[model samples]
Target: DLGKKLLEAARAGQDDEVRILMANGADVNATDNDGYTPLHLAASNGHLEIVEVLLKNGADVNASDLTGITPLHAAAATGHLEIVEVLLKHGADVNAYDNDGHTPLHLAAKYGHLEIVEVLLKHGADVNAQDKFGKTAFDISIDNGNEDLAEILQKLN
Candidate 1:
């Protein structure tokens, strides 16, 4: 119940309750059945304040779920550029690949998130990193018809 409540608090953006749960000694990394840590939900939803609190309290910035989806992966795939910056500040891997073999840049480019792609590139994201089927971030951008996005990625190579 506590773990579920902690997860609920995060999903609801209730940082107050999240703080209470943490003060009660709840594990910051505790996952529900899907293996999503509080950090995962917080970062996934762009709860910047909660992310800050979680990170300040020692949450793993790079914590991955059962599916090998890290907080960075969620932020990138969802077009949360600010969240991506926060995750990076906490040491998240810019090149972390998920179970699908897609890196953060790969997802960002695929989703046409030009700003997210730019941020990742500035942080040294592997623009040439290939995923399953041999698609680079640039390839995904091009395939998705995102010439502007591809341009940013190409300049990095």
Candidate 2:
């Protein structure tokens, strides 16, 4: 019930209510059944304003869910450019890997989110980070048939 309430607040972009809840001793790091935090919900749903509010209120930008996926991963994977930019400005680890060892770059590339990929690389993400399968971001891009992203990765190399 509490988890549902928190997730609902996040999904609804209730910045003021979220703030009050946190101030009233609600756990800022509370996770849902999937181990995703309000930050993850906000990022995944492309709620940039809510994401900013949560981070300003001390949400952990680099907090990974049970699978080690950060809010940055959600934002990048979903192609939410503003959310990605906000997370980067708040110190989200661009190179943080998920359970599959896939970083934001891998997600962006795998999804063919070219703009997100470009933003991530510009933020100092390691273009060569390898996943659990030993595939680099470039490899994922190529494997996903993202020729344009492959070309961009080539330019970086």
Candidate 3:
């Protein structure tokens, strides 16, 4: 399907193909079956070049898919620091929440991405923000057995 093709292109880091598709009228903001955009796919896969190309072509940095997750969220979740920075520079919401109401900081901490967590915190993320499950970034980190992140979060508090 088109979604699969977009995702494949994103995974392959095919900036030229992505540009061509967008230029040919493929929606730059088109979401996959799971509501993930090409930007989201690119960010999740750590395709910094593709991410730059997409952003330059006007891909919405703050575009949330079906799960209310932005490209920044994907980048942070995958520990793609450069992609995350690009998204932030392009105005991605630092506090954007996912379907579970967890911010990128929460995901970064939960997944043990210390650098991502540090970057998010430095970018003005709300460290105390709670998820739909009433779990803060700190809570999630602790639950996920990431003491290092939990300690880092403690400093933020």
* Shift in Å, residue 91, candidate 3: 0.8
For model 2, the run of ten residues with the poorest summed lDDT: 1-10
For model 3, the local distance difference test gives: 0.85
What's the lDDT for residue 148 in model 1?
93
Candidate 1: Cα lDDT at 41: 92
Error of 1 at 121 (Å): 0.5
Query: For residues 1-157, what per-residue lDDT tens digits would candidate 3 score against the true structure?
Result: 5545666788788877777776676766777767888888899988899888878877788888888888998899898988888888888899988989989998898778999888888889999899988999999988999998888887666
Model 2 segments more than 4 A misplaced: 1-3
Residue 102, model 3: Cα distance from true site in angstroms? 0.2
lDDT string for model 1 (2-23, tens) is: 7678887887899799999989
lDDT of 2 at 130: 87
